[PDB]
Scaffold this motif. Structure first.
Motif, PDB file in Angstrom:
ATOM      1  N   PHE A   1       0.801  -1.216   0.000  1.00 47.61           N
ATOM      2  CA  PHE A   1       0.000   0.000   0.000  1.00 47.61           C
ATOM      3  C   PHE A   1       0.843   1.280   0.000  1.00 47.61           C
ATOM      4  O   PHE A   1       1.977   1.306   0.464  1.00 47.61           O
ATOM      5  N   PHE A   2       0.238   2.324  -0.552  1.00 45.33           N
ATOM      6  CA  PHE A   2       0.761   3.684  -0.545  1.00 45.33           C
ATOM      7  C   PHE A   2      -0.176   4.470   0.368  1.00 45.33           C
ATOM      8  O   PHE A   2      -1.357   4.630   0.061  1.00 45.33           O
ATOM      9  N   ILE A   3       0.360   4.911   1.505  1.00 41.81           N
ATOM     10  CA  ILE A   3      -0.407   5.535   2.577  1.00 41.81           C
ATOM     11  C   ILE A   3      -0.065   7.013   2.719  1.00 41.81           C
ATOM     12  O   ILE A   3       1.086   7.381   2.952  1.00 41.81           O
TER      13      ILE A   3
ATOM     14  N   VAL B   1      -4.841   8.983  -4.959  1.00 43.31           N
ATOM     15  CA  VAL B   1      -4.056   7.884  -5.498  1.00 43.31           C
ATOM     16  C   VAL B   1      -3.745   6.898  -4.374  1.00 43.31           C
ATOM     17  O   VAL B   1      -3.559   5.708  -4.599  1.00 43.31           O
ATOM     18  N   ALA B   2      -3.712   7.414  -3.151  1.00 45.60           N
ATOM     19  CA  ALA B   2      -3.358   6.604  -1.982  1.00 45.60           C
ATOM     20  C   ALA B   2      -4.375   5.511  -1.693  1.00 45.60           C
ATOM     21  O   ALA B   2      -5.575   5.694  -1.869  1.00 45.60           O
ATOM     22  N   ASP B   3      -3.853   4.393  -1.198  1.00 42.02           N
ATOM     23  CA  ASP B   3      -4.639   3.229  -0.812  1.00 42.02           C
ATOM     24  C   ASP B   3      -5.239   3.443   0.561  1.00 42.02           C
ATOM     25  O   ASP B   3      -6.268   2.861   0.923  1.00 42.02           O
ATOM     26  N   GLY B   4      -4.586   4.303   1.321  1.00 42.43           N
ATOM     27  CA  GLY B   4      -5.052   4.635   2.657  1.00 42.43           C
ATOM     28  C   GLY B   4      -4.719   6.064   2.983  1.00 42.43           C
ATOM     29  O   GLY B   4      -3.792   6.632   2.424  1.00 42.43           O
ATOM     30  N   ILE B   5      -5.491   6.652   3.886  1.00 41.12           N
ATOM     31  CA  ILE B   5      -5.258   8.024   4.294  1.00 41.12           C
ATOM     32  C   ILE B   5      -5.371   8.103   5.806  1.00 41.12           C
ATOM     33  O   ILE B   5      -6.372   7.676   6.383  1.00 41.12           O
ATOM     34  N   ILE B   6      -4.333   8.624   6.451  1.00 38.87           N
ATOM     35  CA  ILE B   6      -4.415   8.878   7.892  1.00 38.87           C
ATOM     36  C   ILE B   6      -4.170  10.351   8.128  1.00 38.87           C
ATOM     37  O   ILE B   6      -3.168  10.913   7.684  1.00 38.87           O
TER      38      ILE B   6
ATOM     39  N   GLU C   1      -9.023   7.976   7.484  1.00 33.91           N
ATOM     40  CA  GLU C   1     -10.029   8.517   6.580  1.00 33.91           C
ATOM     41  C   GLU C   1     -10.353   7.496   5.494  1.00 33.91           C
ATOM     42  O   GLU C   1     -11.477   7.425   4.994  1.00 33.91           O
ATOM     43  N   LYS C   2      -9.345   6.705   5.150  1.00 38.04           N
ATOM     44  CA  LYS C   2      -9.463   5.702   4.100  1.00 38.04           C
ATOM     45  C   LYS C   2      -8.484   4.564   4.337  1.00 38.04           C
ATOM     46  O   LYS C   2      -7.360   4.787   4.765  1.00 38.04           O
TER      47      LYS C   2
END
Ligand code: ZN
Ligand code: ZN
Ligand code: ZN
Ligand code: ZN
Length: 220
Positions: free
Chosen positions: A24-26, A167-172, A190-191
């Motif tokens: 993942f790209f976070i 584009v990110a797989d996850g968002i903090i 967030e995601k």
């Protein structure tokens, strides 16, 4: 289900079914001084203790500053250097970035990965925004490139920013707030793809010798 890498914060791992999905790209977003670097140091520290090759790219601080910061939380990055850790200094030897461009950054990260050997790797890009300060509109095209190529090279990636998010797989997200002379810090997932993540905002603390600590869950 999926292979997950621990954040280094157990209480946080609970919020994302054990950790960050491999590959993942976070995106770690938030004002300056909101804990994003520390959160990232946890990820690397845990990787190093796990035997993962680890790469930290720093664009605002010095490599020494990163190392000193880690020591604050009883992490000792010094003896891992060039063995299982490379810190690339984009603020200023062979592990330096002359030009802050996306391709130069990737090439240098891949160079470092070749030194550190086979195995799933952790990469922190702190911060990815330095890549597009002057080309704000390129943020999305740059993040897609970064994600595609770095995932291909067996990285799980944290990218701080002070189109990346999409584009990110996850968002903090990280927040700080002063009220009645008190500083309060908050974190929010967030995601997070492929993950039944917690949707609550959590209060966090940054404690000497420990790092980020989850203090409690905010309701409504
Ligand atoms: Zn140094
Ligand atoms: Zn508080
Ligand atoms: Zn979600
Ligand atoms: Zn609730």
């Amino acid at each position: 289900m999926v292979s997950r890498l621990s954040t280094g914060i157990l209480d946080f791992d609970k919020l994302i079914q054990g950790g960050i999905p491999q590959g993942f790209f976070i995106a770690l977003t938030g004002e300056p001084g909101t804990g994003k670097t520390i959160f990232s140091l946890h990820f690397i520290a845990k990787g190093l203790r796990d035997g993962d090759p680890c790469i930290y790219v720093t664009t605002e601080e010095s490599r020494d500053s990163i190392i000193r910061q880690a020591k604050q939380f009883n992490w000792d990055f010094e003896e891992y250097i060039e063995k299982k850790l490379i810190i690339i200094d984009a603020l200023m030897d062979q592990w330096s970035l002359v030009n802050l461009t996306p391709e130069e950054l990737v090439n240098k990260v891949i160079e470092a990965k070749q030194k550190l050997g086979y195995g799933k790797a952790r990469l922190v890009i702190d911060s990815v925004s330095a890549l597009f300060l002057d080309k704000p509109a390129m943020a999305r095209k740059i993040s897609y490139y970064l994600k595609r190529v770095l995932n291909k090279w067996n990285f799980t990636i944290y990218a701080t920013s002070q189109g990346v998010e999409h584009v990110a797989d996850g968002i903090i997200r990280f927040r700080r707030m002063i009220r009645n002379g008190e500083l309060h810090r908050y974190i929010l997932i967030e995601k997070m793809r492929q993950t039944d993540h917690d949707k609550h905002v959590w209060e966090i603390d940054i404690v000497n010798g420990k790092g980020i600590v989850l203090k409690g869950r905010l309701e409504e």
